[PDB]
Amino acid sequence: MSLYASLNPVKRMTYKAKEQAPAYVKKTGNPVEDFYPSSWRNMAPVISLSANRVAVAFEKIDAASNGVKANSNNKPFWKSNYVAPEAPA
Amino acid sequence: LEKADEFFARSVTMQYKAFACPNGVYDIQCTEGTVKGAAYEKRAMAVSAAFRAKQASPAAKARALFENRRHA
Amino acid sequence: MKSVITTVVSAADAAGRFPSNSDLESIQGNIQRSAARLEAAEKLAGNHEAVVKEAGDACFAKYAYLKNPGEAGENQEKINKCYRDVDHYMRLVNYCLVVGGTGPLDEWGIAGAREVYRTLNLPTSAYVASIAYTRDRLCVPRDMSAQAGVEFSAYLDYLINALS
Amino acid sequence: MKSVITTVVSAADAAGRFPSNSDLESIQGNIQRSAARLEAAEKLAGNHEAVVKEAGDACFAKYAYLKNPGEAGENQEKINKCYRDVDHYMRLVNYCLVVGGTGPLDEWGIAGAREVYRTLNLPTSAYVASIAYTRDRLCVPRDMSAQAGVEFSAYLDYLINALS
Amino acid sequence: MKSVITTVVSAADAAGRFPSNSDLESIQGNIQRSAARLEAAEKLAGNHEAVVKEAGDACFAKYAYLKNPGEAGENQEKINKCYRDVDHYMRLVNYCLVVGGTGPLDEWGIAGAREVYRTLNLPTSAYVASIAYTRDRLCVPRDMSAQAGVEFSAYLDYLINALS
Amino acid sequence: MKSVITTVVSAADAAGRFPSNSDLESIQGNIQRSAARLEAAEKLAGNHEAVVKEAGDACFAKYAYLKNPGEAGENQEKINKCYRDVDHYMRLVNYCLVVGGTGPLDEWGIAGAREVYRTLNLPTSAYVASIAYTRDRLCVPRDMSAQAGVEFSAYLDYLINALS
Amino acid sequence: ADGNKRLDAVNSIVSNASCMVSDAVSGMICENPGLISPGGNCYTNRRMAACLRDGEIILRYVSYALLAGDASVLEDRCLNGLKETYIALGVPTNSSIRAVSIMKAQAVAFITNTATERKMSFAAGDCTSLASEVASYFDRVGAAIS
Amino acid sequence: MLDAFSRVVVNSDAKAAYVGGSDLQALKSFIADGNKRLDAVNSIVSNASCMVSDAVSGMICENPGLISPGGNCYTNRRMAACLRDGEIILRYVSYALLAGDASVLEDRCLNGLKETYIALGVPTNSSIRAVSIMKAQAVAFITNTATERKMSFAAGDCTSLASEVASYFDRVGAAIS
Amino acid sequence: MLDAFSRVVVNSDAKAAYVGGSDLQALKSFIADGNKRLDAVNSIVSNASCMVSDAVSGMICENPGLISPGGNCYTNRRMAACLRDGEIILRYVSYALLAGDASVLEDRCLNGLKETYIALGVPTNSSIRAVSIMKAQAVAFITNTATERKMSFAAGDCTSLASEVASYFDRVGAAIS
Amino acid sequence: GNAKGQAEQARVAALATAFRSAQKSASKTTAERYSSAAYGRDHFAHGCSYEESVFNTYPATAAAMRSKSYNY
Ligand SMILES: C=CC1=C(C)[C@@H](Cc2[nH]c(/C=C3N=C(/C=C4\NC(=O)[C@H](C)[C@H]4CC)C(C)=C\3CCC(=O)O)c(CCC(=O)O)c2C)NC1=O
Ligand SMILES: C=CC1=C(C)[C@@H](Cc2[nH]c(/C=C3N=C(/C=C4\NC(=O)[C@H](C)[C@H]4CC)C(C)=C\3CCC(=O)O)c(CCC(=O)O)c2C)NC1=O
Ligand SMILES: C=CC1=C(C)[C@@H](Cc2[nH]c(/C=C3N=C(/C=C4\NC(=O)[C@H](C)[C@H]4CC)C(C)=C\3CCC(=O)O)c(CCC(=O)O)c2C)NC1=O
Ligand SMILES: C=CC1=C(C)[C@@H](Cc2[nH]c(/C=C3N=C(/C=C4\NC(=O)[C@H](C)[C@H]4CC)C(C)=C\3CCC(=O)O)c(CCC(=O)O)c2C)NC1=O
Ligand SMILES: C=CC1=C(C)[C@@H](Cc2[nH]c(/C=C3N=C(/C=C4\NC(=O)[C@H](C)[C@H]4CC)C(C)=C\3CCC(=O)O)c(CCC(=O)O)c2C)NC1=O
Ligand SMILES: C=CC1=C(C)[C@@H](Cc2[nH]c(/C=C3N=C(/C=C4\NC(=O)[C@H](C)[C@H]4CC)C(C)=C\3CCC(=O)O)c(CCC(=O)O)c2C)NC1=O
Ligand SMILES: C=CC1=C(C)[C@@H](Cc2[nH]c(/C=C3N=C(/C=C4\NC(=O)[C@H](C)[C@H]4CC)C(C)=C\3CCC(=O)O)c(CCC(=O)O)c2C)NC1=O
Ligand SMILES: C=CC1=C(C)[C@@H](Cc2[nH]c(/C=C3N=C(/C=C4\NC(=O)[C@H](C)[C@H]4CC)C(C)=C\3CCC(=O)O)c(CCC(=O)O)c2C)NC1=O
Ligand SMILES: C=CC1=C(C)[C@@H](Cc2[nH]c(/C=C3N=C(/C=C4\NC(=O)[C@H](C)[C@H]4CC)C(C)=C\3CCC(=O)O)c(CCC(=O)O)c2C)NC1=O
Ligand SMILES: C=CC1=C(C)[C@@H](Cc2[nH]c(/C=C3N=C(/C=C4\NC(=O)[C@H](C)[C@H]4CC)C(C)=C\3CCC(=O)O)c(CCC(=O)O)c2C)NC1=O
Ligand SMILES: C=CC1=C(C)[C@@H](Cc2[nH]c(/C=C3N=C(/C=C4\NC(=O)[C@H](C)[C@H]4CC)C(C)=C\3CCC(=O)O)c(CCC(=O)O)c2C)NC1=O
Ligand SMILES: C=CC1=C(C)[C@@H](Cc2[nH]c(/C=C3N=C(/C=C4\NC(=O)[C@H](C)[C@H]4CC)C(C)=C\3CCC(=O)O)c(CCC(=O)O)c2C)NC1=O
Ligand SMILES: C=CC1=C(C)[C@@H](Cc2[nH]c(/C=C3N=C(/C=C4\NC(=O)[C@H](C)[C@H]4CC)C(C)=C\3CCC(=O)O)c(CCC(=O)O)c2C)NC1=O
Ligand SMILES: CCC1=C(C)[C@@H](CC2=N/C(=C\c3[nH]c(C[C@@H]4NC(=O)C(C)=C4CC)c(C)c3CCC(=O)O)C(CCC(=O)O)=C2C)NC1=O
């Protein structure tokens, strides 16, 4: 019913919904965690259209080149040195 | 353990026959036939000499094993 | 099975190298000749009971002594084997026209033929007479195209140079 | 001197046989590619002072450490020898475009190159950078035809696969 | 596994002969050198985390371009593999000091190394810089004895002559 | 690799008979199932990062003594191996959902597991706690369809009945 | 109002979405090959996959916004401070705007069924209002970053 | 050593039948896209050197036990032998793709490779992982679906050749399984 | 053995990858024409008894030397052994056609058939002639192209299954060649 | 050979290959003469100072001698 109400355009004006203020989370200055936190990051909605069926579902999006994935930067901990000297000028 | 021996033979033969084909051309070394029809006779010599060598005596064969192992 | 592809892959394999530009360049010549070499093969396939018929008796019209007693063609099953021996060669000519090289001929028809025809006491001159009769009355605008005739005739005298 | 003709004649010579139909069939592919492979060769011939000019300094822009003391490109005559070493390779690419095979490259440029560049302490990665720069900014409608460009590019990465 | 014993037994075996007086005479030289060659080996064994530590960053202080993007030492695990690649060579130097000949080096470190470092695009000059840094600040009275130092240094520049 | 097809072909082979009508009749049930069993599999495939995360710490919240010294989960790599041991089981559940039978579970996860977990001294009750936590908070309209949850849960307690 | 024109317009995009994304980023490389040069930030393996993921996320959101008939979710979720995150990472914004315009051209090609590489079967009529709407929606994401 | 043309000859020779115009259409369709086959083979020979090294490095970075002391790709000699082992496989698959028939690597490459590796102690899992990587690279080159390298072709479809070259790679892993 | 479903499981197990929605479409297309596969298998099991006897009789009437004294199909015992030899091959090809994967006659039928026949003295030419006849019969039954027998099917195309079952017969002759 | 005409065809083949062996280039033959002398000493004359002097001055005596019990 929330999806149906989100897609109905005439209920969008005759029933103007109220804003909900978000929960308090601390800002850290860096925008990569301020605007795209890990609780949301890379989620995006699938639209599947079949006979009398419209389905939308938010999924985490990844792509890949030669063999490793895009979100492999953030692999889980169970899947997881010398310091190089500085070069002179 | 049997056919692994024949793959090991065929591999070193294949690697050594690449010296006789330097970079795409057959050189003077192969030259199996010099007239028309000589290559089939050279085939029939070799495929019979291979049969003749396997009906050798056991003492000759046992000498040939150890002397090949000594020279390799 | 000597052909255009079979030559260049064996050369690249003996050199131990990948297929180069000259290897791919030779297959374009196969592509360009496929449209004249295959019509001769299909024309022979659709007509081979008449071409085999006029060659075998042209063999016997030239050498009428073969039907003598003590010869290679005395009684009827020898002549039936002669027509079969001719049809085998025309089938291999069709196969070499399909392949592109002379592989089917020197693999199954030429290799060892001199040892067979000597000890079984068959004259090779009577073999080459029927092949020469087929080559000489190939008539190039009607029977084939202009280019299919030279491709068909080039495999025929390969047999004549191989048997003589 | 590997080429289309050079392959089929030594194949026929090693078999001890006359030139067959598959031998003549491969030369037709040479005839059909001559009209796209020679355009690249003369375009390189008419333009080769600018093409190695931009490749040699692209070699040094990637590896600026080569002009350090104790390196391969310290003073001026080493850099002049580097431009000469690049021009030698582009001349051999022109020669392989003229011949048809990769014969001039593996005869005079590739064979023994790893022994030379190791004991004379030259990095092969700086050689392949200038060749890759030439391959990557070949621009196929303007600089050549559509078909001459891949014929030109196919010999370039033969050098890159041979040196690396 | 070339050593003093392995040489003379293979010579006596190829001649098909018993061990002679010259065979036993060569082992006395092994006995006389073990009392200077083994102290270098365990001095290296007891100290090898500091010796490889100062060599690997001496490799990067000379060639600071290796940490550039697109290079062999871009990110952290490449540098960790570089320290491992150096420790592997120092372990083989310890093994050749224990054996007596250069067998462990040309068996596991030298043979095939040029094919690996070329196709995996690693510069051998950065390998020899860390080995030359180790050879040049070996200090003869403190670090070893006077005789253990040249035994240790003679195996080090064997690597430098083999990689260059 | 027990499944619908694997059972009926093994039965027809042991009887030495051709596939009958009852053999073809059983595959229709696979066809009718496939449209509810495959969405559970890729729903697990697309979400397994968080499903294994909440199960492994639910294992440790129930049995907090496992992080004691001398236990199975003392230091960090034991816990990392525990998350891996859980992810291995969820992958096999995905495989059994794809196949149709319980073949991948009793082939690679169940057979021999009691001998391993006894001599390596791992408690199986801590294994079944994480699987029971996954089964109990599968929530049938949101996470899957109504019928896919039926199929996903039936393979989960197969593990619980096999390990206990 | 009418959905049979709207749902067709969404279905003409969400079907062939991966080809649109992979063609858009390859065209973006095809103009300037500095991003795949060593030193560009699409040069490594883990960067170009992230660029593909970002292009698909942008296409995901604009396809949802065309279905919803509004752009409020588009500016709440995606464009809520994307430009300064691309600045803080360090991202050439002109090339991403170029890839967005490439996707915008492909979308209005697919909606009008005037794509000259592939043909859909449709009913008879005019979908140019939806084409202008999705052009405006692509201009939203093109202007929200700069 | 048999190409696509000699295969139908050996097929119709057991029949003792002439090659007629019915089964010739499968051969003229082979001629009709011979240019696509050459365009496909060239795109693999062009970057075989990156294809081999990327496949062995991906097999090693997936399984870090091979570079362990006593692993099968431990020393420099064994690693050079692995890079030599993979290149021969790629070369024979290129031969079979050019010939249009798989009969050049069943007898020259795969005939006896099964027990050679288990006489040597070569682990069979990593070899099929490596050519599975090489297969995924080859299909990404027959079509222009590669990530950082795009080659210029004439427009059209090459999925038949991609399925053919995948079918040439599955039997390599099946011969050594 | 291995059906079409366990094949992708053993393919993705070396990856240690979950079976995702990209490679699942090859499995849902396998479900989408499962009825065609059952309709195809039934049409072969229905007249396997005529298929075997016609194949052995055609092999004998092509080569009359087998029934000569000292031929391999000379006596009644050898002829019954030949009719028994062909039916097992047809049964295993039907198993592989039902399973959607050839791995059931890889190891239960063809593993060792090569040297069994040459320890027995079974001529290898007539063996591939007979299964080539059986292949030509099977393709004539997957499609309704048989001469005197027509079976009622729903309308559509079954050429993919005919190519699949031809590919199941090519490796039988290749295993014994 | 083992057929009636096979024994003379070996003669005409062996007389052809000895003439084709004389058509090698200068680099092809001098390196061959050095490698034959290298082959003679490590395989035959191990500690024999006399035969190694024979081999260094006459390489074809080193080469034509076989180290194997080939029984030729
Ligand atoms: C952990 C270690 C690790 C790596 C080293 C890489 C290596 C790697 N690359 C690819 C995958 C590939 N590799 C290439 C190869 C190349 N691309 C080019 O442009 C060059 C010409 C050539 C050498 C670089 C291609 C074309 C693909 C397919 C498309 C792609 O992913 O880029 C795969 C296949 C994935 C699979 O199916 O199993 C792997 C393992 N990935 C990894 O996970
Ligand atoms: C001797 C060297 C030699 C070559 C290197 C090739 C070069 C080549 N390729 C094609 C021509 C072609 N090549 C392809 C192939 C492809 N197109 C794609 O988009 C896919 C990525 C790829 C599939 C593998 C296609 C589709 C054509 C057009 C003609 C055709 O479809 O047959 C043509 C004919 C038309 C033209 O002039 O371009 C030629 C000469 N042929 C040769 O003779
Ligand atoms: C696949 C290729 C292929 C061939 C080319 C032929 C070659 C061939 N022909 C014959 C056998 C023969 N070929 C001939 C033919 C002739 N004798 C003549 O006098 C004329 C020259 C000519 C007829 C015009 C005859 C008569 C025999 C039987 C000879 C005999 O057995 O006495 C035989 C011995 C086996 C047999 O008797 O059938 C063989 C191998 N067979 C083959 O399988
Ligand atoms: C596939 C291979 C193949 C061939 C090589 C020919 C061979 C051939 N030619 C003829 C038949 C003939 N061949 C010729 C000869 C010629 N005709 C002319 O107009 C010219 C003067 C001369 C070509 C230079 C003539 C005149 C006939 C008619 C009957 C005869 O006189 O023999 C026949 C009898 C059937 C017929 O009449 O067509 C056959 C089999 N046909 C084939 O199917
Ligand atoms: C016919 C084919 C043919 C070739 C391909 C070259 C190959 C070649 N180059 C050099 C020699 C050289 N080649 C270079 C070139 C370079 N060094 C670098 O740092 C860069 C990698 C590159 C410049 C971009 C330099 C600097 C030398 C001189 C090295 C030296 O003598 O110290 C030499 C040694 C002889 C000499 O000093 O001239 C040879 C054989 N010469 C040939 O005759
Ligand atoms: C015989 C071999 C041969 C070549 C490979 C090229 C290589 C080449 N390109 C350029 C020159 C150029 N090359 C390009 C590149 C391209 N141009 C475009 O329109 C596309 C965007 C892209 C092709 C994909 C551009 C834009 C210039 C102009 C100057 C520059 O920007 O570098 C120049 C300098 C002289 C000139 O301006 O022409 C040379 C030598 N020329 C040759 O003579
Ligand atoms: C038993 C003896 C033995 C050795 C000597 C080494 C030799 C060796 N090193 C590497 C592999 C490597 N070696 C290095 C080392 C370096 N790269 C540099 O830029 C510097 C020159 C140097 C660090 C100072 C690096 C970075 C790799 C990884 C290369 C890569 O995979 O991209 C490999 C490939 C396998 C692997 O990735 O581990 C091998 C066989 N390994 C051995 O098992
Ligand atoms: C087993 C192999 C092995 C070696 C080759 C050496 C190598 C070595 N030298 C030093 C350490 C040092 N090495 C020197 C060098 C010298 N010292 C002198 O008195 C002379 C002037 C000069 C010898 C010619 C100096 C002065 C230091 C002290 C710290 C420094 O200045 O680097 C260190 C750091 C630890 C330490 O201080 O001892 C190491 C590992 N040590 C080893 O364990
Ligand atoms: C293909 C299927 C497959 C599996 C199911 C697992 C099964 C499995 N787990 C472990 C091994 C282990 N499994 C665990 C897991 C746990 N210990 C606990 O205290 C908890 C019960 C749980 C974490 C929640 C631990 C800690 C080890 C390491 C035990 C040890 O080596 O001391 C081992 C021994 C080999 C190794 O050390 O990795 C095996 C075969 N592995 C597989 O390959
Ligand atoms: C593929 C396998 C798969 C599953 C089994 C589930 C398992 C699962 N559930 C939740 C997450 C949740 N699960 C529930 C439980 C329920 N929700 C309700 O509305 C009911 C009351 C009850 C079903 C009976 C709740 C309330 C949350 C939200 C966060 C929480 O409270 O745990 C999460 C965290 C991510 C998220 O919020 O979705 C996961 C991984 N998800 C999966 O991807
Ligand atoms: C649940 C999923 C779902 C869909 C995917 C659509 C599919 C769809 N579109 C239309 C019907 C239509 N679809 C279009 C759209 C177009 N025609 C064109 O010429 C343009 C290229 C394109 C605009 C982008 C038009 C103009 C009609 C007829 C008017 C209408 O019914 O809206 C119809 C009714 C008649 C028909 O079958 O055509 C259906 C079922 N509707 C749905 O309910
Ligand atoms: C919810 C909405 C949402 C988005 C829009 C994206 C936006 C986005 N992209 C990146 C992160 C990135 N984004 C890119 C993308 C690009 N760089 C370029 O040069 C091209 C112009 C462009 C691809 C076409 C790259 C290359 C990185 C990795 C940067 C890095 O190397 O650290 C990050 C940092 C975290 C991460 O790596 O994922 C974020 C938040 N992600 C989201 O979650
Ligand atoms: C090397 C440089 C290089 C490029 C500059 C681009 C070339 C390119 N092609 C298109 C243009 C397009 N791109 C697509 C997208 C697709 N077509 C389909 O049929 C698939 C479903 C999908 C992925 C292939 C479409 C449909 C068009 C418009 C073509 C048309 O009008 O039919 C566009 C966008 C509009 C335009 O500028 O024309 C670009 C930038 N690709 C490159 O490689
Ligand atoms: C075991 C007993 C035995 C042999 C020896 C060969 C002998 C032989 N070589 C041939 C034919 C032949 N021979 C060679 C040369 C040779 N081939 C190579 O791959 C390399 C590297 C070579 C140099 C040594 C070539 C190049 C050909 C041409 C066919 C080909 O491309 O391989 C032919 C066919 C002649 C013809 O058809 O004209 C024969 C019979 N066959 C046998 O049965």
User: Which range marks the domain in which residue F60 is found?
Assistant: 1-164
**I116-119: Cβ within 8 A, 24+ apart:** I117/I176
Sign of CA dihedral C62, C66, C67, C69: positive
Tokens standing for residue B45: 């010599």
Fold of G1-146: Globin-like (1.10.490)
Q: What Cα–Cα distance (Å) separates residue B62 from each residue in B5, B8, E12? A: 17, 20, 22
Count of positions (residues) in chain D: 164
How far does H73 lie from chain C, in Å, by closest CA? Answer: 24
CA I146 from centre of chain:
17
Mutate to test the pocket of ligand 8, among E53, E143, E144 (most ligand atoms within 8 A of CB): E143
Residues with CB under 6 A from ligand 1: A 65-68; H 47, 50-51, 54, 57-58, 61-62, 133, 136-137, 140, 146-149
**Residue D158 Cα, gap to closest chain B Cα (Å):** 14
| H75–E contact, CB cutoff 8 A | yes
**Would you say how long chain A is, in residues?**
89
Strands A43-50 and A68-69: unpaired
Strands A43-50 and A53-60: antiparallel
Beta strands in chain I (DSSP E): none
DSSP string, chain C: ---HHHHHHHHHHHTT----HHHHHHHHHHHHHHHHHHHHHHHHHTTHHHHHHHHHHHHHHH-GGGGSTTSTT-SHHHHHHHHHHHHHHHHHHHHHHHHSSSHHHHHHTSTTHHHHHHHTT--HHHHHHHHHHHHHT--TTTSS-HHHHHHHHHHHHHHHHHH-
Q: Is the dihedral of CA B6, B43, J13, C102 positive or negative?
A: negative
3-state secondary structure of A53: strand
D58 CA distance to ligand 6 middle (Å): 14
Half-sphere exposure of C127 (CA within 13 A, CB side): 27
Give the rounded distance of the alpha carbon of G19 from its chain centre. Answer: 11
In order of B31, G47, I69, the CA distances from I85 in angstroms are 47, 60, 20
Encode burial over E70-95: b for 16+ CB neighbours within 10 A, e otherwise.
ebbbeeeeebeebbebbbbbbbbbbb
Mutational pocket test of ligand 14: of B17, B32, B35, the residue with most ligand atoms within 8 Å of the beta carbon: B32
Judge residue E152's burial from the number of C-beta atoms within 10 Å of its C-beta, 0-12 exposed, 13-18 middle, 19 or more buried.
buried
Angle, helices H124-142 vs H76-99, to 10°: value is: 50
B72 contacts: CB under 8 Å, gap ≥ 6: none
Longest dimension (CA), chain J: 47
Residue I37: Cβ within 10 Å count:
23
**Intra-chain end-to-end CA distance of chain D, in Å:** 22
I162 phi/psi in degrees, rounded to 5: -70, -40
Local structure of G40: helix, strand or coil? strand
Cα maximum dimension of chain D: 61
Q: Are C164 and C156 in contact (CB under 8 A)?
A: no
Cα–Cα nearest to D155, from D115, D77, D95: D95
* Whole-angstrom distance, CA of residue H110 vs CA of residue H19: 31
Instruction: Give me the residue label for tokens 């092994």.
Output: E30
3-state secondary structure of I146: coil
- The yes-or-no reply on A/D contact (3 CB pairs or more, < 8 Å) is no
Cα→Cα distances B65→B69, E14, I44, Å: 6, 15, 56
The enclosing domain of C16 has a CATH number of 1.10.490.20
Among chain B residues, the shortest Cα distance to H112 is held by: B7
What Å distances lie between residue A75 and C76, G56, H65, H125, H176, CA to CA? 86, 21, 20, 25, 33
Q: Are strands A64-65 and A43-50 parallel, antiparallel or unpaired?
A: unpaired
User: Nearest ligand, CA of residue G115?
Assistant: 13
CA G134 to CA E18: how far, in whole Å?
A: 93
Chain G CB within 8 Å of residue H147 CB? yes
Q: How far apart are CA E106 and CA I118, in angstroms?
A: 49
- By C-alpha distance, which of H141, D68, D61, G23 is closest to E68? D61
**Dist. CA H143–CA H155, nearest whole Å:** 11
Contacts of C37 (CB under 8 A, 6+ apart): C97, C100, C148, C151
Phi, psi torsion values for A53, nearest 5 degrees: -140, 125
CA distances from G5 to A45, E80, G8, J32 (A): 21, 59, 5, 83
B3 to chain E, closest Cα gap in Å: 28
Domain total of chain E: 1
E strands in D33-159: none
- Cα gap F163→F157, rounded to integer Å: 10
Return d(Cα F84, Cα I93) in angstroms, integer: 41
Q: Residue H5: which of C31, C48, C99 has the nearest Cβ?
A: C99
Chains in contact with B, where contact means 3 or more Cβ–Cβ distances below 8 Å, are C, D, E, H, J
Residues F100/F3, Cβ–Cβ less than 8 Å: yes
**H133 neighbourhood in chain A, CB within 8 Å:** 67
- Angle made by CA atoms F149, F155, F158, in degrees to the nearest 5: 135
Residue I96, Cβ density class (10 Å: 0-12 exposed, 13-18 middle, ≥19 buried) = buried
Probe target for ligand 2 pocket from H36, H152, H163, with the most ligand atoms within 8 Å of CB: H36
CA-nearest residue for atom 33, ligand 3, is C116
What residues have CB less than 8 Å from D5, skipping those under 6 apart?
A: D27, D30
**H164 within ligand 2 shell (Cβ under 6 A):** no
| Residue G67 · residue G10 · CB < 8 Å | yes
Identify the residue whose tokens are 């049995």. Answer: F63
CA distance E77 to chain A (A): 8
Q: Whose CA is nearest to atom 22 of ligand 5?
A: D82
Residue A71 DSSP label: G
CA separation for the pair I9, H65 (Å, rounded): 23
* Gap from E82 CA to chain H (nearest CA, Å): 14
Name the CATH superfamily, with its identifier, for domain I1-177: Phycocyanins (1.10.490.20)
Asked if I161 contacts I40 with a C-beta cutoff of 8 angstroms, the reply is yes
Kindly list the protein residues whose Cβ atom lies closer than 6 A to any atom of ligand 6: D 43-44, 47, 50-51, 137-139, 142-143
What phi, psi does A56 have (nearest 5°)?
Answer: -130, 135
Q: Which residue out of H107, H116, H117, H176 would a mutagenesis test of the B interface target, given it has the greatest number of B Cβ atoms within 10 Å?
A: H116
Would you call H119 and B10 a contact, using CB atoms and an 8 Å cutoff? no
Q: Do the strands A68-69 and A53-60 form a parallel or antiparallel pair, or are they unpaired?
A: unpaired
User: And the tokens for E10?
Assistant: 């293979």
At which residue do the structure tokens 């000091």 appear? E97
Measure the CA–CA gap between D127 and D161, rounded to whole angstroms: 12
Provide the 8-state DSSP code for I102.
G
Tell me chain B's radius of gyration from C-alpha atoms. Answer: 16
Q: Which ligand has the shortest distance to the CA of G3?
A: 11
Rounded to whole angstroms, the Cα distance separating I154 from H26 reads: 29
Yes or no: say if C100 and H5 are a contact pair by the CB < 8 Å rule: yes
Contact partners for chain D, using 3 or more CB pairs closer than 8 A, are B, C, E, H
Q: Cα separation of G103 and E88, whole Å?
A: 52
Residues shown for chain B: 72
G and H interact (at least 3 Cβ pairs within 8 A): yes
Determination technique used: cryo-EM
User: Max Cα separation, chain A?
Assistant: 70
Task: With H, G, I as helix, E, B as strand and everything else as coil, classify residue A68.
Answer: strand
* Cβ atoms of D96 and D155 closer than 8 Å: yes
Write out the two tokens for C160. 């004549």
Residue nearest to atom 9 of ligand 12 (CA): G54
Amino acid at A30: N
Q: What is the number of other CB atoms lying within 10 angstroms of the CB of residue D147?
A: 16
Q: Which residue has the tokens 């391969």?
A: D72
- Give the N- to C-terminal CA distance of chain E in Å, as an integer: 22
Question: Where do we find the tokens 């070949």?
Answer: D138
CB C151 within 8 A of CB C93: no
Judge whether D60 and D125 are in contact, CB under 8 Å: no
**Cβ-count burial of I70 within 10 angstroms (0-12 exposed, 13-18 middle, 19+ buried)?**
exposed
**How many angstroms does the Cα of residue D14 sit away from the middle of ligand 14?**
7
C-beta C50 within 6 A of ligand 4: yes
Give the mutation target among A65, A66, A71, A79 for probing the ligand 1 site: most ligand atoms within 8 A of CB: A66
DSSP-derived letter for residue A48 is E
Report whether I134 contacts I144 (CB < 8 A). no
Round to whole Å and give the CA distance between C149 and C44: 11
Query: Contact G43/E68, CB-based, under 8 Å?
Result: no
Beta strands in chain G (DSSP E): none
Residues I125, I127, I132, I138, Cα dihedral to 10°: 170
Write the CB contacts of A50 (distance below 8 Å, at least 6 apart in sequence). Answer: none
Concatenated DSSP letters of chain H: ---HHHHHHHHHHTTT----TTTTHHHHHHHHTHHHHHHHHHHHHTTHHHHHHHHHHHHHHH-TTTTSTT-TT-SHHHHHHHHHHHHHHHHHHHHHHHHTSGGGTTTTTSTTHHHHHHHHT--HHHHHHHHHHHHHHHHHHHTT--SS------SS--HHHHHHHHHHHHHHHHHH-
Q: Does F59 reach chain A within 8 Å, measured CB to CB?
A: no
Ligand nearest to the CA of C94: 4
* Positive or negative: CA dihedral F66, F72, F78, F83: negative
Going C93 to C95 to C100 to C103, the CA torsion angle's sign is: negative
Q: Which amino acid is at I62?
A: E
Looking up tokens 């860390």 gives E130
- E with C: 3 or more CB pairs under 8 Å? no
* Residue boundaries of the structural domains of chain G: 1-146
CA nearest neighbour of H113 among H177, H68, H70, H169: H177
3 state DSSP class of A57: strand
To the question of whether residue G42 is assigned a binding role by annotation, the answer is no
CA-to-CA distance for J42 and A36, rounded, in angstroms?
74
Q: Go through H5-42 and write b for each residue having 16 or more CB atoms within 10 A of its CB, e for each that does not.
A: bbbbbeebbeeeebbeeeebeebeebbebbebbbbbbb
Resolution in A: 3.0
The tokens for D55 are 């490749």
In sequence order, which residues have a C-beta less than 8 Å from that of residue D59 and are 6 or more positions away? D66, D82, D86, D126, D127, D129, D130, D133
For residue D32, count CB atoms less than 10 angstroms from its CB and return exposed for 0-12, middle for 13-18, buried for 19 or more: middle
Closest CA relative to residue G87, chosen from A74, A32, A44 = A32
Instruction: Report the alpha-carbon angle I131-I133-I136, nearest 5.
Output: 110
Ligand nearest to the CA of J13: 14
Residue type, F1: M
How far apart, in whole angstroms, are the C-alpha atoms of residue C92 and residue C95?
Answer: 5
The Cα–Cα gap between I155 and H172 comes to 39
CB-based contact E97:E41 (threshold 8 Å):
yes
Q: Record the tokens describing residue H169, joined without a space.
A: 């790679």
